[PDB]
Amino acid sequence: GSSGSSGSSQPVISAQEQETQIVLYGKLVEARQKHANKMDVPPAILATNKILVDMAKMRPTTVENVKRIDGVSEGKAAMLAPLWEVIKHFCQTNSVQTDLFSSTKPQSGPSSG
């Protein structure tokens, strides 16, 4: 047979950001749903809590950062646009910090099409 074990536990999040994540998370969940039916996929199939949670933490505004999220598979993120799309506005209207990733990209001002 085998014997499992338990892992560590992180301390609660400071209301400072915690709150923002709480209010945001709720917004995402709502979107995922209305979007789940559209694609004709179970509210869980579209995006699992694991994904939503991360998105609510990193608060990715660009699909690029979303892809980095855990659980999301390359490309899939795209379809999950309506999700992050809400984060960009939620923070844009509340001047809330976002894209709190480690490996970010500069702004050289691209030009295509």
UniProtKB/Swiss-Prot annotation:
Disease per UniProt entry: Werner syndrome: A rare autosomal recessive progeroid syndrome characterized by the premature onset of multiple age-related disorders, including atherosclerosis, cancer, non-insulin-dependent diabetes mellitus, ocular cataracts and osteoporosis. The major cause of death, at a median age of 47, is myocardial infarction.
Quaternary structure and interacting proteins, as annotated: Monomer, and homooligomer. May exist as homodimer, homotrimer, homotetramer and/or homohexamer. Homotetramer, or homohexamer, when bound to DNA. Interacts via its N-terminal domain with WRNIP1. Interacts with EXO1, PCNA and SUPV3L1. Interacts with PML (isoform PML-4). Interacts (via KBM motif) with XRCC5 and XRCC6; promoting recruitment to DNA damage sites. Interacts with RECQL5; this interaction stimulates WRN helicase activity on DNA fork duplexes.
Location relative to the cell: Nucleus, Nucleolus; Nucleus; Nucleus, Nucleoplasm; Chromosome
Protein name from the UniProt record: Bifunctional 3'-5' exonuclease/ATP-dependent helicase WRN
Function: Multifunctional enzyme that has magnesium and ATP-dependent 3'-5' DNA-helicase activity on partially duplex substrates. Also has 3'->5' exonuclease activity towards double-stranded (ds)DNA with a 5'-overhang. Has no nuclease activity towards single-stranded (ss)DNA or blunt-ended dsDNA. Helicase activity is most efficient with (d)ATP, but (d)CTP will substitute with reduced efficiency; strand displacement is enhanced by single-strand binding-protein (heterotrimeric replication protein A complex, RPA1, RPA2, RPA3).
Domain notes: The KBM 2 (Ku-binding motif 2) and XLM (XLF-like motif) mediate cooperative interaction with XRCC5/Ku80 and XRCC6/Ku70 and recruitment to DNA damage sites. The isolated helicase core (residues 517-1093) interacts weakly with the HDRC domain in vitro.
Gene name per UniProt: WRN
The organism's place on the tree of life at top rank: Eukaryota
Family per record: Belongs to the helicase family. RecQ subfamily.
Region of the whole protein represented: 1140 to 1239 of 1432
Post-translational modification: Phosphorylated by PRKDC.
Domain HRDC positions: 18-97
